[PDB]
């Protein structure tokens, strides 16, 4: 069912799973388009692992923005200069390969910059 | 550089007043026709003579079946007459040649004489207009008179009641108005058809064929 929250209108959840990935371990949950001949999914039988298509794509007016109504952006060491102007539009996430000292300085600068952080409590 | 705005305003006012006079004459014509037909039939019954009114010269037609499983000639005639969907509807002039080509599409269509109220309702309610440049029309609802005057006003039919008259009476302008007016998209009936698979004139209940004066009733649920 479509989920409606504020202004972001999402049309689908339950990230799609590969056909037959239930009773076959070697088939991983990552989706693929089965080619086959009589492969059911291609025929689109009534109610059996319906496949992704273009129609499920959300609205580009709101597409990439996160429930924070704010696009996310990665940071590594000190790259906060391009964030000063658009503090109402871009949230910042620390890269997972950042040590505690650098992450501490980044969180210090960001908090006074007044920009939200996603993984604030990382490795501490 | 500012006189143009006021000049356009007087142009609009002149167009409005002229359209007023046009629709008054049209309303005169309709009541005149009704009075004439009533008095002629009364005179016919008074004397020993009979009076028959000619066919209405304009026919509204609707497609009934889908797209698959059709004869190639049938599909070609549909594409030539602009009946593409399964509930599209169009007006056609009445000529012996036109009726002859309609004869080879009768089983899949329903065609009849318009009557005035329902053609007015169709124009106001479900009417849509090709607006843009040739072959790039970009169908758009009427909602106004600017575009109709822009493209069709050349022949001095700018307005909406002008279209109403030019349609209900077989007048000078069809190949322009009918080409201008997008095919009507019709809603399914309020109650439903009788039998898509049997003719109307058959004693068994059925629908396809010639309905003449009856088509207005089914249009009133088509809308």
């Amino acid at each position: 069912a479509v989920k409606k929250v504020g202004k972001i209108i999402k049309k689908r959840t339950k990230k799609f799973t590969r056909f037959q990935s239930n009773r076959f371990m070697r088939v991983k949950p990552a989706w693929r388009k089965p080619r086959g001949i009589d492969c059911r999914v291609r025929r689109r039988y009534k109610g059996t692992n319906l496949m992704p298509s273009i129609g499920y794509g959300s609205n580009k007016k709101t597409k990439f923005l996160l429930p924070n109504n704010k696009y996310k952006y990665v940071v590594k060491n000190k790259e906060m200069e391009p964030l000063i102007m658009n503090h109402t539009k871009y949230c910042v996430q620390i890269a997972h390969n950042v040590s505690s000292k650098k992450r501490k300085q980044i969180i210090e600068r960001a908090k006074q910059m007044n920009v939200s952080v996603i993984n604030a409590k990382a490795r501490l | 550089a500012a006189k143009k705005i006021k000049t356009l305003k007087l142009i609009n006012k002149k167009k409005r007043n002229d359209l007023r006079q046009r629709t008054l004459r049209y309303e005169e014509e309709y009541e005149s026709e009704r009075k004439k037909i009533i008095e002629l039939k009364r005179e016919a019954r008074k004397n020993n003579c009979f009076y028959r009114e000619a066919e209405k010269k304009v026919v509204f037609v609707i497609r009934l079946k889908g797209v698959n499983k059709l004869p190639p000639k049938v599909r070609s005639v549909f594409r030539l007459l602009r009946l593409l969907q399964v509930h599209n509807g169009v007006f056609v002039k009445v000529n012996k040649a036109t009726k002859e080509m309609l004869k080879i599409v009768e089983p899949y269509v329903t065609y009849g004489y318009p009557t005035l109220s329902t053609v007015r309702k169709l124009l106001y309610k479900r009417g849509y207009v090709r607006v843009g440049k040739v072959r790039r029309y970009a169908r758009k609802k009427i909602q106004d008179n600017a575009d109709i005057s822009k493209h069709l006003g050349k022949y001095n039919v700018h307005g909406i009641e002008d279209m109403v008259y030019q349609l209900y009476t077989c007048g000078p302008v069809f190949k322009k108005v009918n080409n201008f007016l997008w095919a009507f998209k019709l809603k399914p009936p309020r109650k439903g058809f009788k039998a898509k698979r049997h003719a109307f004139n058959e004693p068994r209940p059925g629908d396809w064929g010639n309905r003449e004066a009856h088509i207005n009733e089914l249009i009133n649920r088509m809308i």
Partner: protein, 104 residues
């Protein structure tokens, strides 16, 4: 000649050392020219494409003023220098300075 302001844009828009893309959020695209009042990648605002421009940025602990040919300087002083080299964007630059000042 052989170069122009409009010309350099079609050589910089793709292959640059100052453009940073946003891998996670595809909507993000930023340009880090030290002569940009805003980091939006556009040929009407990029410092390396404008005929003459200026902004305010940070350089290792202190806010540094720069005017395009590339003169380097050191709030009342900020506004007096801004009107000294003045040419919307003026007050935007002053606001940018006042926001950047608070940062350690």
């Amino acid at each position: 000649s052989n170069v122009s302001n409009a010309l350099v844009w079609e050589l910089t828009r793709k292959s640059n050392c100052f453009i940073k893309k946003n891998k996670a959020g595809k909507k993000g695209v930023f340009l880090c020219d030290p002569l940009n009042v805003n980091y939006k990648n556009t040929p009407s605002s990029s410092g390396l494409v404008k005929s003459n421009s200026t902004n305010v940025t940070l350089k290792d602990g202190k806010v540094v003023f720069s005017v395009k040919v590339v003169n380097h300087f050191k709030m009342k002083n900020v506004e007096k220098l801004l009107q000294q080299h003045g040419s919307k964007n003026k007050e935007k630059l002053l606001k940018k300075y006042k926001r950047l000042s608070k940062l350690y």
